[PDB]
Amino acid sequence: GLPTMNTPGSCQFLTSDDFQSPSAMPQYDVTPEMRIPGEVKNLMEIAEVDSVVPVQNVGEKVNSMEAYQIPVRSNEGSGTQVFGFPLQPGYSSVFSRTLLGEILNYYTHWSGSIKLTFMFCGSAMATGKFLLAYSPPGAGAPTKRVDAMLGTHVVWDVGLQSSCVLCIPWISQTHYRYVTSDEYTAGGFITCWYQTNIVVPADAQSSCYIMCFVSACNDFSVRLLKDTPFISQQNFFQ
Amino acid sequence: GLPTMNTPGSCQFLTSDDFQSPSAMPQYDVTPEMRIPGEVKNLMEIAEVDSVVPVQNVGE
Amino acid sequence: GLPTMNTPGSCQFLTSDDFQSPSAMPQYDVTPEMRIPGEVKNLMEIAEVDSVVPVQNVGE
Amino acid sequence: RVADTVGTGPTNSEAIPALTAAETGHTSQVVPGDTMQTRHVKNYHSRSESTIENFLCRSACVYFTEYENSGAKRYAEWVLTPRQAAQLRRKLEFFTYVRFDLELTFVITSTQQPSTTQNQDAQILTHQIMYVPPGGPVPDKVDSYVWQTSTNPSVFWTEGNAPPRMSIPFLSIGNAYSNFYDGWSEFSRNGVYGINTLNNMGTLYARHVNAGSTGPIKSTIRIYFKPKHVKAWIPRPPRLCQYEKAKNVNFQPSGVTTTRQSITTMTN
Amino acid sequence: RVADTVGTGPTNSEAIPALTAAETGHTSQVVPGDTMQTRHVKNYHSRSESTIENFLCRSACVYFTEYENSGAKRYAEWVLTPRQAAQLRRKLEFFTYVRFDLELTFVITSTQQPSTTQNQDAQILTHQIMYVPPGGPVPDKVDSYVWQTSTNPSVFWTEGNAPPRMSIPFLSIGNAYSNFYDGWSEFSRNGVYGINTLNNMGTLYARHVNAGSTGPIKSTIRIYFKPKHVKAWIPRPPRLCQYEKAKNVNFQPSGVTTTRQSITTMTN
Amino acid sequence: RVADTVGTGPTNSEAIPALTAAETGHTSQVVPGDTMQTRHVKNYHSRSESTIENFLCRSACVYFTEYENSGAKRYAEWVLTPRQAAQLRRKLEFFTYVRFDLELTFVITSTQQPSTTQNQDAQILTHQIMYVPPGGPVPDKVDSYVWQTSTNPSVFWTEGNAPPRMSIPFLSIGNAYSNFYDGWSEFSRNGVYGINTLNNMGTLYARHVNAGSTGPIKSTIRIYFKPKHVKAWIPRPPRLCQYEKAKNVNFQPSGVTTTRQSITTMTN
Amino acid sequence: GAQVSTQKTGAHIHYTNINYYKDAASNSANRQDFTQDPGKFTEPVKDIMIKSLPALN
Amino acid sequence: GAQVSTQKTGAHIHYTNINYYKDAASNSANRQDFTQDPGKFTEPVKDIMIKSLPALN
Amino acid sequence: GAQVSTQKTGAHIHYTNINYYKDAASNSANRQDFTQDPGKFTEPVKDIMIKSLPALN
Amino acid sequence: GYSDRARSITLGNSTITTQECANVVVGYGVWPDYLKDSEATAEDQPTQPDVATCRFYTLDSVQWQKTSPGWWWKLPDALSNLGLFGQNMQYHYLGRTGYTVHVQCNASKFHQGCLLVVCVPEAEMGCATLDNTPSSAELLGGDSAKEFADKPVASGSNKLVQRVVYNAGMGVGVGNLTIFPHQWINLRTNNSATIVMPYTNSVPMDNMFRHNNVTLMVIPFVPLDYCPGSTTYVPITVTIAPMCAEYNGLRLAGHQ
Amino acid sequence: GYSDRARSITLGNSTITTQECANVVVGYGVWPDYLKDSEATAEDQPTQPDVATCRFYTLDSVQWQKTSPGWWWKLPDALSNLGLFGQNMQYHYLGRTGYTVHVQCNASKFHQGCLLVVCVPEAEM
């Protein structure tokens, strides 16, 4: 009899533990493996793929395909705003239901840069110029193009290639941020403005739509696995 | 006293387990083996032998 | 089953003990370290610093 | 380890990293040093918590059920199926096909029932759990012969110590467990439709070996799954809608997301 | 590992692999590539679950019996014999002779009996199990001297912890355990006929060491066998009929199998 | 090992080790052999108990709370925060920033409540403790679905054995845990002021898995912290005053020290 | 005197074992003994029968 | 036949493991397998697309 | 991969330790780290001050 | 020199030409091939029809209107009645094939719109009545396309599919359908969309009547629009080519 | 391959993209650089704000009508109230800088017109 001593933490069931257990089916021949396309080895191979963003989630628009459309028409003025939302990739309604948002909810902390791709879906005769902008926190959100021009911006010229990219970089005081709402780790604001105008000829539609796709860059990371506050049940399903 | 920690699954009786147990009859001389025809080492040596099939299993 | 024997002092909680325990968050990436001035490695680095003495602690 | 940012400077060129074409079904591989000036940063973050093994290897309650030491409900039965609990079901359905070992843990707990019987002095309760693969006999009653477990795996557990736990190997006639099946059981294209077609996993039964007391006692058993050595293929989008049944993918139509006030509002 | 199919092509020859003669008591060793065209398949299946050690090495309940802490039935006795439970008996009778070690496991569980006695506050019960080889003295009562176990093997078990378990070596005066015996005990060809002739295995007794309480308590002991290091010879056909007694091969005549509607019907 | 005194003799020189200038913010490094004659002493004392790891690595109770098996208070919740107990709080606040692993130990103990219910015969109680990181769902009731712990860490403990204990890694979005924060949450310099701004640690819930008895039972859980692998920076003066709340540094003005009778009195 | 052997794993890792008792009847079951020889039963004839040959000639 | 591997520690120590059961399905989970290949999903096109080049030319 | 170190004994013997978990956050506390450097606090001045010298000259 | 817009695809006796196309999407990085010997299960020798089955089959056209929720096609069922591909899949028990889907829609420079083309593997669909599962006449319509709805389908006691579009019938978010192999047809840039999907399944072969491996979904995220005077009828055409199709288990003709 | 029409210009945290542009005009053949030591006069050490001042500032838009004579901007004054460029030029006595002017006007294929863009040094009016 080898003299032993039991320490605090014996006969306890920690759900995130890693031990060895006796097998119920001993010497069981497991079916051989076959080659299946699309093997996943990390959750960041999924978050790194684009997905359409519902920017127009206003009113009944969530119950149609109009949530994904950003309306842009010919304006008798200049420098007005197209859209805006905060850099909250997992808490804001604009981002909480996309592939990136969905994966982010299962975790507590996130880090890295963000990609926002915009596709212009007018006619081949429509021309335009837009000013995508990201403003780090510290002031409010910009309310004119003279306040948004001062941040990290791109001037998108519309023609041929109908797709521009705005990369939101990592500008934080900490290494990580929170997926939940926390002022200590506020992200900033993303806005879009008219640079010049949408110009069209006769017999062509002066109202077009833009679409947005969100994804993550190579530096993106997540931590602290937790439960998602989306799924729920009252009784066991049958 | 070597400090240890018990894990879930102690003092349980899994009928398909494989351990070592103290012998009730220690230092017992077992009868020697003899050669008997027809030693079986697998159940598929039995299933690989023909047997008559009752195809006309109708009524009495 | 390796035959063992438990000694006095099992399943007890001594607050000044030194063991190993299963981690609740497995494979968790810890924030990297940065250089902060004034790292302390002993309490006698603090007691070796002057401080003013209240000798006239009389009345109010 | 995640990639490290490269420091860049001012450019004036005919290169166009920002301008792309999303109609090609290709995600742009643009880094932040393509649309602005950056500094060299030495990144040390790891992607060690996003692995499928780390994301899925955690115990989850998939079911619990009750039985008694007297009366009518003397034993409990449950066709094995994880699609009763929402959490683990929604985690697995991220992929089309999976392949894993299993780690089973059982939390059995008894309670004394209200009654008017007197002089109750209970002895320790022992429980038996038995697995019947599809095809074997079933326990029509509590004291039937099937509980002899000559070949069927089973676990005897006395109340008061560590919860019983076992390891199950990847049991499937196919090469992977199908989370979704778009088809029928019959070649006549009628009958059972969906993944219930491939649910041939066996049945789990549970009982008290002794009655313990002269008064009533109800024992509840909670079952916990824990996938190990996970492989997964063909990622799918998340459910979004709320589940309704355990055998099909039926749902009630729900909006894309929750709303805000305008297209310019920075508040939920 | 099972054999791998060899790919074949079209043939026109005087070879006749299909045509054989079954009157020679020989099974035809024809592979599918003899009556059709095949492809080369790399088989990876294993015959690792059909082994006799894997088929037989699983614990099975062979008996259970009761005794009390007061009254008349104060101890329990059982001549060791596996032919009381149907499942393990039918598994072993697949062969004529076997030879194995044994692993014994006991599940002892107590229950409080209904009574009108008051102020019952029971102390932990300890049980004793004792094996008497053929020839030794027997416990005529509960507090007899035979329970001193000077030479007889015995196990003391306190209720509340891991079930008692021991290892028994191949105990036989012969070279193998005979599952069937076609003969008598006496040279006069009368008397005991059959395998009861070779059943000289000893007796197992069980009791409470202390009474525990002032109220009644009934303890049931379940015995589990588990063959190890198995050897077997001369396979026999399966029983088919239902068993009747534990000492003989008596049966009630039963039909070859269950029926169907016609010789062309594809339904049970 | 502490320094060893050097033996010195009589001196008459223009050296002035005693005379210094304290306005330079520098502590004089004078040894006793500078103002007197000494002998050579071989010192063997060690500074092995003044280390921060030895000073801080001891378990301390930081909180305890109650719940019941029936009635209203069926589960317990506690936002994790060590600033409720005075002892460990005052030990940590010696430094401005710290960085350590954690060792959690839980002492769960039940008590029977006074009541008039009869025929009480309780079964062993099992407890569940669950950690919810900030952002996840919360258990609005006792039998809610959140207790399935698909991803949330949790511990199941049956009363009667070793206390549950786990290890927590340094969880912080920053590079160190800030014991003090001189600022606000909002950029508008209003709102929450102080260290409550950086307290985003999650929540701990506790419940009974079974009710056990038909009578009332109250279970108290005591939580114990134990820092490991400690790093600390920028030592601060000790609190002196008595603490008032857990979220701020508010205090009531107190005298520098306790008094004596005169400037020449050698008595407290 | 530890014995290192191979584990039962799928197709298309090792384990260690030590004997603690001096009775060989206490060791674990002999699970991995995949040896089969069906020739005692399937073909017990005195003369060899070539498959692609007339059984009666 | 002990296996010594490296522990999961921070940036900017080893552990020992032994297998006790002959079924490979009883071993601990494969936690440290940090291998990613997002190219099957992010860029599944037939022709290569240079980043600093017009996607349509 | 056992680590043998020295025990804390008086002045005027070894112990063995093995790591069982793959998380470095589960190891025992780092009790024996007797390293002190009071120079950051006791003497933080820009110019060196010789003890047997007038502080102000 | 050559351009990236022009691209010709030859299969069997069929050639597809396009002068304004985006890059081809090849499945999950895998090109459809044949089943190997170290991965097969059925022992007999399979038959490969090659040119007779691996060619471009064109289906009926659908009209893109200003209010079209979208369409879908169960790929294996769609061709179960075309040429020798249908006959081989009708006389055999197991089959295996990949696909090459080409979707075409042409309009002028004064039209606008955007269509999502996605090959969804194992698109199990849901019923409008939670009580039952949908009919085979509701799920798969051969020789035609199946239309989505803009409003939720009513419940009751039937076996109708929940053809709401923003839920994709699968009870998900439609904007996430870009996790599967996909391609966008933008009227101002794109003209057609090609996808080369390999054989995806959890078994080496499968019966081709009671199981549909993939599904082609065409949804117009951005509606079609034009100004009075331009063409109003805008159709959408779908051409599917089987690739590396093999069959095993010859039997009598039928599906019961 | 690439075309001569497409061109991106990155400065600071600003990127300008164009898909239909003529070749860039670089001054009098000279690229803006810093003042050298063999050409300086003021003895003290200068401050270079770099990213905070060398970035793209957009001004208000003007409407091109069928009867517009034209517009002009005094370059140094135009930005004297924008970001940190204006602040640095407000707290200092001497300054030195070159410029990168991008003028944008988009219209359809059914519009016509021609605009002259000229950087006039020392345009005394």
Ligand SMILES: CCCCCCCCCCCCCCCC(=O)O
């Ligand atoms: C004594 C108890 C033994 C219990 C043995 C249980 C064996 C069956 C395990 C069922 C696993 C089902 C996995 C389903 C995975 C999926 O399709 O998503």
Ligand SMILES: CCCCCCCCCCCCCCCC(=O)O
């Ligand atoms: C303290 C308890 C010890 C019990 C010792 C039991 C020893 C006898 C074992 C009997 C084995 C009988 C095997 C019969 C096999 C057969 O003939 O089929």
Ligand SMILES: CCCCCCCCCCCCCCCC(=O)O
């Ligand atoms: C199943 C229970 C798991 C419990 C997990 C608890 C994880 C959170 C630990 C909180 C530590 C807080 C340390 C604060 C240090 C400080 O700022 O002074």
